Amino acid sequence: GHMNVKLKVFHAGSLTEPMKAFKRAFEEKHPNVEVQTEAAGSAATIRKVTELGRKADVIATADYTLIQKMMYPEFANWTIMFAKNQIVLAYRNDSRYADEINSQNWYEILKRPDVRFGFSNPNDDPCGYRSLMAIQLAELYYNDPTIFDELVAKNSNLRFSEDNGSYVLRMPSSERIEINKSKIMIRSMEMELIHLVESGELDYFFIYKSVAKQHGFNFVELPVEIDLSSPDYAELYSKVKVVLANGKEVTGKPIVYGITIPKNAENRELAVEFVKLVISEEGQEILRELGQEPLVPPRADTAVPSLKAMVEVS
Ligand code: MOO
Numbered sequence: 616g617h618m619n620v621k622l623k624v625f626h627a628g629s630l631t632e633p634m635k636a637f638k639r640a641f642e643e644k645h646p647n648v649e650v651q652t653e654a655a656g657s658a659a660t661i662r663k664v665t666e667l668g669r670k671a672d673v674i675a676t677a678d679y680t681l682i683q684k685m686m687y688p689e690f691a692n693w694t695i696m697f698a699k700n701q702i703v704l705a706y707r708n709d710s711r712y713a714d715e716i717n718s719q720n721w722y723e724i725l726k727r728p729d730v731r732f733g734f735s736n737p738n739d740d741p742c743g744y745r746s747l748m749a750i751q752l753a754e755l756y757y758n759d760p761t762i763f764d765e766l767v768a769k770n771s772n773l774r775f776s777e778d779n780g781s782y783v784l785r786m787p788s789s790e791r792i793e794i795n796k797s798k799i800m801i802r803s804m805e806m807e808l809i810h811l812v813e814s815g816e817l818d819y820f821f822i823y824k825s826v827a828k829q830h831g832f833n834f835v836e837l838p839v840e841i842d843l844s845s846p847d848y849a850e851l852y853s854k855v856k857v858v859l860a861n862g863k864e865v866t867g868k869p870i871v872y873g874i875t876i877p878k879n880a881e882n883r884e885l886a887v888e889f890v891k892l893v894i895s896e897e898g899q900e901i902l903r904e905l906g907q908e909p910l911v912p913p914r915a916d917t918a919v920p921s922l923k924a925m926v927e928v929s
């Protein structure tokens with residue numbers, strides 16, 4: 616009824632567990648509000664607003680740059696950066712060769728004929744493009760130009776090209792992506808890969824460390840030089856770029872999650888309160904307790920007057 620406001624929050628799949636907690640905390644403080652959350656790969660999440668005509672009060676992505684590239688200036692005009700993450704290679708203890716995989720031999724294990732691994736669709740999800748970026752960055756770190764070629768290029772129509780030191784991968788439209796089902800499985804968002812690994816269909820999957828911890832997966836920590844986790848290695852991460860099917864270019868960058876309130880949000884006032892919760896000490900703790908490092912202090916890419924005291928604007 617008129618005493619039941621619905622705050623619509625569309626978010627990155629990897630924010631599914633934190634969002635359950637933000638929803639419960641928010642509703643405890645606003646008993647007449649139902650936070651309606653929906654998970655999807657970040658680019659698909661943004662398209663709900665930018666292409667499907669749906670209205671969301673809050674958009675949260677796993678890569679803040681997608682808000683900038685896909686929503687400015689028609690649907691948003693600021694982004695707050697509030698959390699970080701790290702790419703790892705996760706598995707079950709009964710996954711093929713789980714007893715022998717480690718940080719030094721991970722790519723050789725994935726190269727074994729009977730081993731199947733997964734990553735999400737780069738056109739829809741940052742985890743997916745980040746997975747390909749990490750594998751290509753591995754060629755530089757391990758000084759082995761064939762790692763991406765053997766793992767991905769020979770099992771799909773996805774290929775990195777070199778252009779004066781940097782490498783670029785141009786994505787086919789999603790409908791034209793070709794995958795060798797004998798080695799790889801892909802899904803629209805990384806969270807969808809979880810059940811494939813749990814059922815035994817996949818042995819390993821590239822995923823965020825926070826999600827691996829939340830879902831009880833073991834994992835190999837990849838070198839900081841390739842795992843996109845540290846601001847201090849931004850110069851190395853920038854050596855790889857992926858051009859999504861929608862034409863937007865994403866460059867390897869330290870993983871930083873973004874949140875915004877779309878310009879056409881129906882319940883802006885409540886959305887401001889929700890964003891405040893996410894970047895408050897309470898929200899930082901919710902993230903930390905769920906195995907995801909919050910960005911402290913939160914930052915904004917431009918002035919955000921309604922939240923000036925909560926953010927650092929450079
Ligand atoms: O936007 Mo994801 O958390 O890389 O589904």
Ligand SMILES: [Mg+2]
Binds near residue numbers: 759760761762763764
């Ligand atoms: Mg190569």
